[PDB]
Amino acid sequence: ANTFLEEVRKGNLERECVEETCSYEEAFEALESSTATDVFWAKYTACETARTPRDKLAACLEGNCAEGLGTNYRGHVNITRSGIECQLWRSRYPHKPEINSTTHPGADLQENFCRNPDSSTTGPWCYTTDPTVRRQECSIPVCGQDQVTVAMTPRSEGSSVNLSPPLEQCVPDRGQQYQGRLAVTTHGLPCLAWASAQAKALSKHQDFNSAVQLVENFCRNPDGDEEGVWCYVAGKPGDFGYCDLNYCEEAVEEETGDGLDEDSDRAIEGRTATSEYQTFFNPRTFGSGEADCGLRPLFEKKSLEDKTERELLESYIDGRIVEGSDAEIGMSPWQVMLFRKSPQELLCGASLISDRWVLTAAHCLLYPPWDKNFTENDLLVRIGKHSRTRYERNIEKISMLEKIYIHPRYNWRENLDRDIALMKLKKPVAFSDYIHPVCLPDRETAASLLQAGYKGRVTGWGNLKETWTANVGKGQPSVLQVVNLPIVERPVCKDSTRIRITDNMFCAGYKPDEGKRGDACEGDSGGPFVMKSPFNNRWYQMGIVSWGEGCDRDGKYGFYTHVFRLKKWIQKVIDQFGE
Ligand SMILES: [Ca+2]
Ligand SMILES: [Ca+2]
Ligand SMILES: [Ca+2]
Ligand SMILES: [Ca+2]
Ligand SMILES: [Ca+2]
Ligand SMILES: [Ca+2]
């Protein structure tokens, strides 16, 4: 920066910049690259506190340690003060970082490592993967000293030495014959006695099993609910509440049929046996569309076989991966795009499972980290869509709703299991050949299909990836996505990620390859996992799209919430409107 004979000498970084005090033009010859000078000035903005010695400045530039407030950090440390795993700053889950290159580009926010662009006083910090914890300072070693920013106190798992373990075996029959003194709901609200007026009135009018033990006030399961035991409470009529227990991790897989012998070879097509749909709900209370659910009028009723229907056969050579293409119009009559009231913003997806009931993920209504809190007049639904940019009045309908029921056991803290939410249509949609509810299978039907070798059909518009993650380069495609996802068995599913595979979830997706990231993070928030049944000639919904692990880290599968256990729960809502 002086000694004009040194102006005959082209400036260097390590020379004029660190040790001397290089100008921006000196720094410029001293780095050439524009991004190099960008990072250079970001550091020097954060590294005036470490200008000298050269070790201080170099350690502040590199960022593999903590200097000053540590916003210059660029190391590998992905562990907070309390030890909660760091959230990737590209993934908006759990806590959506509005802080990126748009707000404070200098901090140069990395893949998963801690970052302090918004100048938190706690030192370098990272969004905690825990939804109950937004940020947290990390154990970032101080530049020039054997000191980390925070003493390492990881969140150790619960100690089993201080907890009294229950030695009761996990209750079968879904708590039908439970005898314990638990007379309060899952979260502690006490259940009324069955001798009370409302509980007795509900037992008299309902088809509650007599063999199921009807105790004074304890929550029971006389209707054969698969979600667990339950009870009614006083207040608004029809209120239902579970009473959580030591329920086993139960899946439809572990039941051995008494009619399907050991002859599993050469899958046999149904011999002129069209299944009579034994209706499970009453048409007066559940509404229309029950009997003829899940049939495309222009495809199955018109005898038109779609291109990718034959691709559901697992007998394909190695089951070659199917890429979702420009779908035919109206192949998904029950999918609904849930937009925000104003402005028109594609927020979530939902399933029109009946003529007056809509199933959507509870995440579409409440998630504390993203600050979403919805009322009745804050959302609109659009049913029968093919392209979002056009309102094709020729097919779709624009609707509002009138009531929404939140699943009581919605626990967003740990794993978003039981991601359940029901909605009632304010304006019933006139029947059409392009709109049709999808059937909800029973346990036996789902078990048969999983044992029938039919691959599922996953529908989505690609909003899942952009909602969960913020990668740039692949905007929203202009056509609907429909893919044939084979069912993944439980072992590879559990081994794929550290998130517990809860009792209400199963697997789906392709098997990933080395270097070739699959399409497991395609779809919409709150979407259904649809499958085809050659045994019933109809389509079924089995899973709800939950938070996918394929969006955060490479090579992950799809994990989705069980829905075939909802039937006994479903009645619990419709009697709230059938009284
Ligand atoms: Ca110089
Ligand atoms: Ca000089
Ligand atoms: Ca000069
Ligand atoms: Ca120079
Ligand atoms: Ca020099
Ligand atoms: Ca030197």
Coordinates of C-alpha atoms and ligand atoms in Angstrom, one line a residue:
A1 CA 0.0 0.0 0.0
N2 CA 3.1 2.1 -0.1
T3 CA 6.7 2.1 -1.4
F4 CA 6.0 2.8 -5.0
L5 CA 8.7 0.4 -6.1
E6 CA 6.2 -2.2 -4.7
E7 CA 3.8 -0.8 -7.2
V8 CA 6.0 -2.5 -9.8
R9 CA 5.2 -5.6 -7.9
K10 CA 1.6 -6.9 -8.3
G11 CA -0.2 -7.1 -4.9
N12 CA -0.7 -10.4 -3.1
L13 CA -3.4 -11.4 -0.7
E14 CA -1.2 -12.9 2.1
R15 CA 1.2 -10.0 1.6
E16 CA -0.6 -6.6 1.3
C17 CA -4.0 -7.8 2.7
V18 CA -3.3 -9.7 5.9
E19 CA 0.1 -8.5 7.1
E20 CA -0.1 -5.0 5.5
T21 CA -3.5 -3.4 4.9
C22 CA -4.4 -3.9 1.2
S23 CA -6.7 -1.6 -0.6
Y24 CA -9.7 -2.9 -2.5
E25 CA -7.7 -2.7 -5.7
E26 CA -4.7 -4.2 -4.0
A27 CA -7.1 -6.9 -2.6
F28 CA -8.4 -7.2 -6.1
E29 CA -5.1 -8.1 -7.8
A30 CA -4.6 -10.1 -4.6
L31 CA -7.6 -12.3 -5.3
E32 CA -8.8 -11.6 -8.9
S33 CA -12.1 -13.3 -8.3
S34 CA -15.1 -11.0 -7.6
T35 CA -16.5 -13.6 -5.1
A36 CA -13.1 -13.7 -3.5
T37 CA -13.3 -10.0 -2.8
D38 CA -16.9 -10.4 -1.6
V39 CA -15.8 -13.0 1.0
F40 CA -12.8 -10.9 1.7
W41 CA -14.8 -7.8 2.6
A42 CA -17.3 -9.9 4.6
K43 CA -14.5 -11.2 6.7
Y44 CA -12.8 -7.8 7.1
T45 CA -16.2 -6.5 8.2
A46 CA -16.2 -9.2 10.8
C47 CA -12.5 -9.3 11.3
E48 CA -11.6 -5.7 12.3
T49 CA -11.6 -7.3 15.8
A50 CA -8.8 -9.7 14.7
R51 CA -6.7 -7.5 12.3
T52 CA -3.5 -8.4 14.1
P53 CA -1.8 -10.7 14.7
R54 CA -1.8 -12.4 11.3
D55 CA -2.9 -15.6 13.0
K56 CA -5.9 -13.8 14.4
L57 CA -6.9 -12.4 11.0
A58 CA -6.3 -15.7 9.2
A59 CA -8.4 -17.6 11.8
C60 CA -11.1 -15.0 11.5
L61 CA -11.0 -15.3 7.7
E62 CA -11.0 -19.1 7.5
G63 CA -14.0 -19.4 9.8
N64 CA -13.2 -22.8 11.1
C65 CA -13.2 -21.2 14.5
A66 CA -15.0 -18.4 16.4
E67 CA -13.8 -14.8 16.2
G68 CA -15.6 -11.9 17.7
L69 CA -19.3 -12.7 17.6
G70 CA -18.4 -15.6 15.3
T71 CA -20.6 -14.7 12.4
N72 CA -17.4 -15.3 10.3
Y73 CA -17.6 -19.0 11.3
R74 CA -17.1 -21.4 8.3
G75 CA -16.2 -24.7 10.0
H76 CA -17.8 -28.2 10.3
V77 CA -19.4 -27.7 13.8
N78 CA -23.0 -28.7 13.5
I79 CA -23.7 -29.2 17.3
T80 CA -25.5 -26.6 19.4
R81 CA -25.0 -25.6 23.0
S82 CA -27.6 -28.1 24.2
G83 CA -26.7 -30.7 21.6
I84 CA -29.8 -30.6 19.3
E85 CA -29.0 -31.5 15.7
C86 CA -28.5 -28.5 13.4
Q87 CA -31.2 -27.7 10.8
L88 CA -30.0 -27.3 7.2
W89 CA -30.5 -23.7 6.3
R90 CA -31.8 -24.6 2.9
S91 CA -34.6 -26.7 4.3
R92 CA -37.3 -24.4 5.7
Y93 CA -38.0 -27.2 8.2
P94 CA -38.2 -27.1 11.1
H95 CA -37.7 -23.3 11.5
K96 CA -37.7 -21.4 8.2
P97 CA -34.7 -19.1 8.0
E98 CA -35.6 -15.8 6.4
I99 CA -31.9 -15.0 6.9
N100 CA -30.0 -15.9 3.7
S101 CA -28.0 -14.2 1.0
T102 CA -31.1 -11.9 0.5
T103 CA -30.8 -10.4 4.0
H104 CA -27.1 -10.8 5.1
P105 CA -25.1 -12.3 2.2
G106 CA -21.8 -11.7 4.1
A107 CA -22.1 -14.6 6.5
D108 CA -22.1 -17.1 3.6
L109 CA -24.5 -19.6 5.1
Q110 CA -23.3 -23.1 4.6
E111 CA -24.9 -26.6 4.0
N112 CA -25.8 -27.5 7.7
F113 CA -23.2 -25.8 9.8
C114 CA -24.0 -23.0 12.2
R115 CA -24.4 -19.5 11.0
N116 CA -25.1 -16.1 12.5
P117 CA -26.1 -13.7 9.7
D118 CA -28.7 -11.8 11.8
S119 CA -26.1 -11.1 14.5
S120 CA -27.3 -13.1 17.5
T121 CA -25.3 -12.3 20.6
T122 CA -24.9 -16.0 21.5
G123 CA -22.1 -16.4 19.1
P124 CA -22.3 -18.7 16.0
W125 CA -25.6 -20.6 16.1
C126 CA -27.7 -23.0 14.0
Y127 CA -31.4 -23.5 13.7
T128 CA -32.1 -26.5 15.8
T129 CA -33.8 -29.5 14.1
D130 CA -36.2 -29.3 17.0
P131 CA -39.4 -27.4 16.1
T132 CA -39.7 -26.3 19.7
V133 CA -36.3 -24.7 19.4
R134 CA -35.6 -22.1 16.7
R135 CA -32.0 -21.3 17.2
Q136 CA -29.1 -22.2 19.4
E137 CA -25.4 -21.2 19.8
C138 CA -22.9 -23.9 18.8
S139 CA -19.8 -25.3 20.5
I140 CA -17.6 -23.1 18.2
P141 CA -13.9 -23.1 19.2
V142 CA -12.6 -19.5 19.7
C143 CA -9.9 -18.5 17.2
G144 CA -6.5 -18.4 19.0
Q145 CA -7.6 -20.2 22.2
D146 CA -8.6 -23.6 23.4
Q147 CA -12.1 -22.4 24.1
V148 CA -15.4 -23.3 22.5
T149 CA -18.2 -20.6 22.4
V150 CA -20.3 -22.7 24.7
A151 CA -19.5 -25.5 27.1
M152 CA -20.6 -28.8 25.6
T153 CA -23.8 -30.0 27.3
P154 CA -25.5 -32.3 24.8
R155 CA -29.2 -33.2 25.2
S156 CA -28.7 -36.7 26.6
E157 CA -31.6 -39.2 26.2
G158 CA -33.8 -39.9 29.2
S159 CA -32.0 -41.9 31.9
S160 CA -33.7 -45.3 32.5
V161 CA -32.1 -45.4 36.0
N162 CA -34.5 -42.7 37.3
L163 CA -37.7 -43.9 35.5
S164 CA -40.1 -46.5 36.8
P165 CA -40.6 -48.9 33.9
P166 CA -44.1 -50.4 33.2
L167 CA -44.0 -54.2 33.1
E168 CA -47.5 -54.4 31.6
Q169 CA -47.5 -56.1 28.2
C170 CA -48.6 -53.8 25.3
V171 CA -52.4 -54.1 25.1
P172 CA -53.9 -56.0 22.2
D173 CA -57.4 -55.7 20.7
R174 CA -56.7 -51.9 20.6
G175 CA -57.7 -51.5 24.3
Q176 CA -61.2 -53.1 23.8
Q177 CA -61.0 -54.8 27.2
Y178 CA -58.7 -52.4 29.2
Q179 CA -59.3 -52.4 32.9
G180 CA -57.0 -49.7 34.3
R181 CA -57.9 -46.6 36.2
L182 CA -56.9 -44.1 33.4
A183 CA -60.0 -41.9 33.3
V184 CA -58.4 -38.8 31.8
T185 CA -57.7 -38.1 28.2
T186 CA -54.3 -38.1 26.5
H187 CA -53.4 -34.6 27.7
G188 CA -55.0 -34.8 31.1
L189 CA -58.6 -33.7 30.6
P190 CA -60.8 -36.1 32.7
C191 CA -63.4 -38.2 31.0
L192 CA -66.9 -38.2 32.2
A193 CA -68.4 -41.3 33.9
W194 CA -70.4 -43.6 31.6
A195 CA -73.2 -43.3 34.2
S196 CA -73.5 -39.6 33.3
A197 CA -76.3 -38.4 31.1
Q198 CA -74.4 -37.7 27.9
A199 CA -72.2 -40.8 28.1
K200 CA -75.2 -43.1 28.8
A201 CA -77.1 -41.4 25.9
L202 CA -74.2 -41.9 23.5
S203 CA -73.8 -45.6 24.6
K204 CA -77.5 -46.3 24.1
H205 CA -77.8 -44.8 20.6
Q206 CA -74.4 -46.1 19.3
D207 CA -73.6 -49.6 18.1
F208 CA -71.1 -50.1 20.9
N209 CA -69.9 -53.6 21.6
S210 CA -71.3 -55.3 24.7
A211 CA -68.4 -57.7 25.0
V212 CA -66.2 -54.6 25.4
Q213 CA -66.0 -53.9 29.1
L214 CA -68.0 -50.7 29.9
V215 CA -66.4 -49.4 33.1
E216 CA -67.6 -46.3 35.1
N217 CA -65.5 -43.5 33.6
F218 CA -62.5 -45.3 32.0
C219 CA -61.9 -44.7 28.3
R220 CA -62.8 -47.8 26.2
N221 CA -63.0 -49.0 22.6
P222 CA -66.4 -50.6 22.0
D223 CA -66.6 -49.5 18.3
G224 CA -63.3 -51.2 17.4
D225 CA -61.3 -48.0 16.9
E226 CA -57.8 -48.7 15.6
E227 CA -56.3 -45.4 16.6
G228 CA -56.7 -46.3 20.3
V229 CA -59.1 -46.1 23.3
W230 CA -61.3 -43.1 23.5
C231 CA -64.1 -41.3 25.5
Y232 CA -66.6 -38.5 25.2
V233 CA -66.4 -35.3 27.2
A234 CA -68.9 -32.7 28.2
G235 CA -69.3 -29.4 26.4
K236 CA -69.9 -29.2 22.6
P237 CA -71.8 -32.4 21.7
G238 CA -69.8 -35.2 20.0
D239 CA -66.4 -34.3 21.4
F240 CA -64.1 -37.3 21.3
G241 CA -60.7 -37.8 23.1
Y242 CA -58.3 -40.6 23.2
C243 CA -56.5 -41.9 26.3
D244 CA -52.9 -42.7 25.3
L245 CA -51.4 -45.9 26.5
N246 CA -48.6 -48.4 25.8
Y247 CA -49.9 -49.2 22.4
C248 CA -47.7 -51.5 20.3
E249 CA -46.2 -50.3 17.1
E250 CA -48.8 -52.1 15.0
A251 CA -48.9 -52.3 11.2
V252 CA -51.2 -54.0 8.7
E253 CA -48.4 -56.3 7.7
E254 CA -48.2 -58.7 10.6
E255 CA -51.6 -60.4 10.2
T256 CA -51.7 -63.9 8.7
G257 CA -54.8 -64.7 6.6
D258 CA -57.0 -67.7 7.3
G259 CA -58.0 -67.9 3.6
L260 CA -54.8 -67.2 1.7
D261 CA -52.8 -70.4 1.7
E262 CA -49.1 -70.9 0.9
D263 CA -49.5 -70.7 -2.9
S264 CA -47.8 -67.3 -3.6
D265 CA -46.6 -67.8 -7.2
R266 CA -48.0 -66.7 -10.6
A267 CA -50.3 -63.8 -9.5
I268 CA -53.8 -64.8 -10.7
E269 CA -56.1 -62.2 -12.2
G270 CA -59.6 -62.1 -10.7
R271 CA -61.9 -64.7 -12.5
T272 CA -65.0 -62.6 -13.3
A273 CA -65.4 -61.6 -9.6
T274 CA -66.2 -57.9 -9.3
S275 CA -66.2 -57.0 -5.7
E276 CA -69.5 -55.7 -4.3
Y277 CA -68.7 -52.6 -2.3
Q278 CA -70.0 -53.4 1.2
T279 CA -70.7 -49.8 2.4
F280 CA -69.1 -49.1 5.8
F281 CA -70.9 -45.8 6.5
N282 CA -74.5 -44.8 6.4
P283 CA -75.4 -42.7 3.3
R284 CA -77.7 -40.5 5.3
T285 CA -74.9 -39.4 7.7
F286 CA -71.8 -39.8 5.7
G287 CA -73.3 -38.4 2.5
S288 CA -73.1 -39.5 -1.1
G289 CA -70.2 -40.9 -3.1
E290 CA -69.6 -43.7 -0.7
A291 CA -70.7 -46.7 -2.8
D292 CA -69.0 -45.7 -6.1
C293 CA -65.8 -44.2 -4.7
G294 CA -62.5 -44.3 -6.5
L295 CA -63.6 -45.0 -10.1
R296 CA -62.5 -42.8 -13.0
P297 CA -65.6 -42.4 -15.3
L298 CA -63.5 -41.6 -18.4
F299 CA -60.8 -44.3 -17.7
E300 CA -62.3 -47.3 -15.9
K301 CA -66.0 -46.7 -16.6
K302 CA -65.1 -45.7 -20.2
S303 CA -62.8 -48.7 -20.5
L304 CA -59.7 -46.5 -21.2
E305 CA -56.5 -47.9 -19.6
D306 CA -53.9 -45.2 -18.8
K307 CA -50.3 -45.5 -19.9
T308 CA -48.7 -46.0 -16.4
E309 CA -51.3 -48.4 -15.1
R310 CA -49.4 -51.4 -16.4
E311 CA -46.2 -49.9 -14.8
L312 CA -47.7 -50.8 -11.3
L313 CA -46.8 -54.4 -11.9
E314 CA -43.7 -55.4 -9.9
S315 CA -43.0 -58.1 -12.5
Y316 CA -41.2 -55.5 -14.6
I317 CA -37.5 -56.3 -15.1
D318 CA -35.9 -54.9 -11.9
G319 CA -38.9 -52.5 -11.8
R320 CA -37.3 -49.7 -13.8
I321 CA -37.8 -46.2 -12.2
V322 CA -40.7 -44.4 -13.6
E323 CA -40.3 -40.6 -14.2
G324 CA -43.4 -38.5 -13.7
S325 CA -44.6 -37.1 -17.0
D326 CA -47.3 -34.7 -18.3
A327 CA -50.3 -36.4 -16.9
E328 CA -53.7 -36.9 -18.7
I329 CA -56.4 -34.5 -17.7
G330 CA -58.5 -35.3 -14.6
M331 CA -56.8 -38.6 -13.7
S332 CA -57.0 -37.5 -10.0
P333 CA -60.6 -36.4 -9.3
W334 CA -60.2 -36.1 -5.5
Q335 CA -56.9 -34.0 -5.2
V336 CA -57.5 -30.4 -4.1
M337 CA -55.2 -27.4 -4.2
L338 CA -55.5 -25.5 -1.0
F339 CA -54.6 -21.8 -1.6
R340 CA -54.4 -19.0 0.9
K341 CA -57.3 -16.6 1.0
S342 CA -55.4 -13.7 -0.3
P343 CA -53.2 -13.4 -2.3
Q344 CA -53.6 -16.6 -4.4
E345 CA -50.7 -18.7 -3.1
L346 CA -50.4 -22.5 -3.5
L347 CA -50.0 -23.6 0.1
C348 CA -51.1 -27.2 0.6
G349 CA -52.7 -30.2 -0.9
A350 CA -55.8 -32.1 0.3
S351 CA -57.9 -35.1 -0.6
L352 CA -61.6 -34.9 -1.4
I353 CA -62.3 -38.3 0.2
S354 CA -66.1 -38.0 0.1
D355 CA -68.8 -35.6 -1.1
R356 CA -68.6 -33.4 2.1
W357 CA -65.4 -34.4 4.0
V358 CA -61.9 -33.3 3.1
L359 CA -58.7 -34.8 4.6
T360 CA -55.6 -32.6 5.0
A361 CA -52.5 -32.7 7.1
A362 CA -52.7 -30.9 10.5
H363 CA -49.4 -29.2 9.4
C364 CA -51.3 -27.2 6.8
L365 CA -53.1 -25.4 9.7
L366 CA -50.5 -25.0 12.5
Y367 CA -46.8 -25.3 12.8
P368 CA -45.1 -23.0 15.3
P369 CA -41.7 -22.5 13.6
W370 CA -43.3 -21.1 10.4
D371 CA -45.9 -19.0 12.3
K372 CA -49.0 -20.4 10.5
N373 CA -52.3 -20.0 12.4
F374 CA -55.4 -20.5 10.4
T375 CA -59.1 -19.6 10.9
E376 CA -62.1 -20.3 8.7
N377 CA -61.9 -17.2 6.5
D378 CA -58.1 -17.7 5.8
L379 CA -58.1 -20.5 3.2
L380 CA -59.8 -21.5 -0.1
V381 CA -59.9 -24.8 -1.9
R382 CA -59.8 -25.6 -5.6
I383 CA -61.0 -29.0 -6.7
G384 CA -60.2 -30.7 -10.0
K385 CA -57.1 -28.8 -11.1
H386 CA -54.6 -29.5 -13.9
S387 CA -52.7 -26.2 -14.2
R388 CA -52.4 -23.6 -11.5
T389 CA -51.9 -20.6 -13.8
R390 CA -55.3 -21.2 -15.5
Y391 CA -58.7 -21.4 -13.9
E392 CA -60.1 -23.9 -16.4
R393 CA -63.8 -23.4 -15.5
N394 CA -64.5 -26.3 -17.9
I395 CA -63.3 -28.8 -15.2
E396 CA -62.5 -27.4 -11.8
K397 CA -64.5 -25.8 -9.0
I398 CA -63.5 -23.0 -6.5
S399 CA -64.9 -23.5 -3.0
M400 CA -64.7 -22.4 0.6
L401 CA -65.3 -24.4 3.7
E402 CA -67.4 -24.0 6.9
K403 CA -65.7 -26.0 9.6
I404 CA -62.3 -27.6 10.3
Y405 CA -61.6 -30.3 13.0
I406 CA -58.1 -30.6 14.3
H407 CA -56.9 -34.1 15.4
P408 CA -56.5 -33.8 19.2
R409 CA -53.3 -35.8 19.3
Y410 CA -51.4 -33.5 16.9
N411 CA -47.9 -33.5 18.3
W412 CA -45.6 -31.4 16.2
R413 CA -42.8 -31.6 18.7
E414 CA -41.2 -34.9 17.7
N415 CA -42.2 -36.5 14.4
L416 CA -45.5 -35.1 13.1
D417 CA -47.3 -38.4 13.5
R418 CA -51.1 -38.5 13.4
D419 CA -50.9 -35.6 10.9
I420 CA -54.7 -35.6 10.7
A421 CA -57.1 -32.7 10.0
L422 CA -60.7 -32.9 8.7
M423 CA -62.7 -30.2 6.8
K424 CA -66.4 -29.8 5.9
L425 CA -67.3 -28.4 2.6
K426 CA -69.4 -25.2 2.9
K427 CA -70.6 -25.6 -0.7
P428 CA -71.3 -29.2 -1.8
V429 CA -69.9 -29.7 -5.3
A430 CA -72.4 -30.8 -8.0
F431 CA -71.6 -34.3 -9.2
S432 CA -69.4 -34.6 -12.3
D433 CA -67.4 -37.2 -14.2
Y434 CA -64.1 -35.4 -13.4
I435 CA -64.7 -35.3 -9.6
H436 CA -65.0 -38.4 -7.5
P437 CA -64.1 -39.5 -4.0
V438 CA -61.4 -42.2 -3.4
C439 CA -62.2 -45.3 -1.4
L440 CA -60.6 -45.8 2.0
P441 CA -59.5 -49.4 2.4
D442 CA -59.9 -51.6 5.4
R443 CA -57.2 -53.6 7.1
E444 CA -57.8 -56.8 5.1
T445 CA -57.9 -54.9 1.8
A446 CA -54.7 -53.1 2.5
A447 CA -53.0 -56.3 3.7
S448 CA -54.2 -58.1 0.5
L449 CA -52.9 -55.3 -1.7
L450 CA -49.5 -55.2 0.1
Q451 CA -49.5 -59.0 -0.5
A452 CA -50.9 -58.6 -4.1
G453 CA -47.8 -56.9 -5.5
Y454 CA -49.4 -53.6 -6.8
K455 CA -47.3 -50.5 -6.7
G456 CA -48.8 -47.3 -5.4
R457 CA -49.7 -44.2 -7.4
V458 CA -48.3 -40.9 -6.0
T459 CA -49.8 -37.6 -7.1
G460 CA -48.3 -34.2 -6.5
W461 CA -47.4 -30.9 -8.1
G462 CA -43.9 -30.6 -6.7
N463 CA -44.8 -28.1 -3.9
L464 CA -43.3 -30.5 -1.3
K465 CA -39.7 -29.7 -2.2
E466 CA -40.1 -25.9 -2.3
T467 CA -42.2 -25.9 0.9
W468 CA -39.8 -28.0 2.9
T469 CA -36.5 -26.8 1.2
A470 CA -35.2 -23.7 -0.5
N471 CA -33.0 -25.1 -3.3
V472 CA -32.7 -22.8 -6.4
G473 CA -32.6 -24.1 -10.0
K474 CA -35.8 -26.0 -10.4
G475 CA -38.9 -23.8 -10.2
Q476 CA -42.4 -25.0 -10.1
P477 CA -43.1 -27.2 -13.2
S478 CA -46.2 -26.4 -15.2
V479 CA -47.7 -29.9 -15.4
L480 CA -49.1 -32.3 -12.8
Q481 CA -46.8 -35.1 -11.5
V482 CA -48.0 -38.7 -11.1
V483 CA -45.5 -41.4 -10.3
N484 CA -45.5 -45.2 -9.6
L485 CA -43.9 -45.7 -6.2
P486 CA -43.3 -49.2 -5.0
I487 CA -43.8 -50.0 -1.4
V488 CA -40.6 -50.2 0.6
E489 CA -40.5 -52.8 3.4
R490 CA -39.9 -51.7 7.0
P491 CA -36.2 -52.6 7.5
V492 CA -34.7 -50.4 4.8
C493 CA -37.3 -47.8 5.8
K494 CA -36.1 -47.6 9.4
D495 CA -32.4 -47.8 8.4
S496 CA -32.8 -44.8 6.1
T497 CA -33.2 -42.1 8.8
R498 CA -33.0 -41.5 12.5
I499 CA -36.7 -40.4 12.7
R500 CA -38.7 -43.1 14.5
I501 CA -41.1 -45.0 12.1
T502 CA -44.2 -44.5 14.2
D503 CA -47.1 -46.9 14.5
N504 CA -49.2 -44.7 12.1
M505 CA -46.7 -44.5 9.2
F506 CA -45.5 -46.7 6.4
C507 CA -42.9 -46.5 3.6
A508 CA -43.1 -45.6 -0.1
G509 CA -40.6 -44.5 -2.8
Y510 CA -37.9 -45.7 -5.1
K511 CA -34.7 -47.2 -4.0
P512 CA -32.0 -44.5 -4.4
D513 CA -28.9 -45.0 -6.5
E514 CA -25.3 -43.7 -6.1
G515 CA -25.0 -40.1 -7.4
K516 CA -28.5 -40.1 -8.8
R517 CA -31.0 -38.5 -6.4
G518 CA -34.4 -39.9 -7.0
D519 CA -37.8 -38.1 -7.0
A520 CA -38.7 -39.0 -3.4
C521 CA -39.2 -35.3 -2.6
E522 CA -41.9 -34.7 -5.2
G523 CA -45.5 -33.9 -4.4
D524 CA -47.6 -31.6 -2.2
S525 CA -48.0 -31.0 1.5
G526 CA -50.9 -33.1 2.9
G527 CA -51.2 -35.2 -0.2
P528 CA -52.7 -38.8 -0.2
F529 CA -50.8 -42.0 -1.1
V530 CA -53.1 -43.6 -3.7
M531 CA -52.9 -47.2 -4.9
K532 CA -54.8 -49.3 -7.4
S533 CA -56.6 -52.5 -6.5
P534 CA -57.2 -55.1 -9.3
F535 CA -59.2 -57.1 -6.8
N536 CA -61.8 -54.3 -6.3
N537 CA -61.2 -52.4 -9.6
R538 CA -61.1 -49.2 -7.5
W539 CA -58.5 -46.8 -6.1
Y540 CA -57.6 -46.5 -2.4
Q541 CA -55.9 -44.0 -0.2
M542 CA -53.4 -45.5 2.3
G543 CA -51.0 -42.7 3.3
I544 CA -50.8 -39.0 3.9
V545 CA -47.7 -37.2 2.8
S546 CA -45.7 -36.2 5.9
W547 CA -42.4 -34.4 6.2
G548 CA -40.1 -36.3 3.8
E549 CA -36.5 -37.1 4.6
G550 CA -35.5 -37.0 1.0
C551 CA -35.6 -33.2 0.9
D552 CA -33.0 -32.6 3.7
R553 CA -30.3 -35.2 3.0
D554 CA -29.6 -37.2 -0.2
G555 CA -30.6 -40.8 -0.7
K556 CA -33.7 -41.0 1.5
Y557 CA -37.1 -42.7 1.1
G558 CA -40.7 -41.6 1.6
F559 CA -42.4 -41.9 5.0
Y560 CA -46.2 -41.3 5.1
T561 CA -49.0 -41.4 7.8
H562 CA -51.4 -44.3 8.0
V563 CA -55.0 -43.5 7.0
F564 CA -56.8 -46.9 6.9
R565 CA -57.5 -46.8 10.6
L566 CA -59.6 -43.6 10.3
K567 CA -63.0 -45.2 9.7
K568 CA -64.1 -45.5 13.4
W569 CA -62.6 -42.0 13.9
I570 CA -64.5 -40.7 10.8
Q571 CA -67.9 -41.6 12.3
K572 CA -66.8 -39.7 15.4
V573 CA -66.9 -36.5 13.3
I574 CA -70.0 -37.1 11.2
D575 CA -72.3 -37.8 14.2
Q576 CA -71.2 -34.3 15.3
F577 CA -73.2 -33.2 12.2
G578 CA -75.8 -36.0 12.2
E579 CA -77.4 -35.0 15.5
Ligands
CA1 CA 0.7 -2.6 -2.1
CA2 CA 3.1 -2.2 0.1
CA3 CA -1.5 1.2 -6.0
CA4 CA -0.7 -3.7 -6.3
CA5 CA 4.8 -6.2 0.6
CA6 CA 5.1 -15.0 4.1

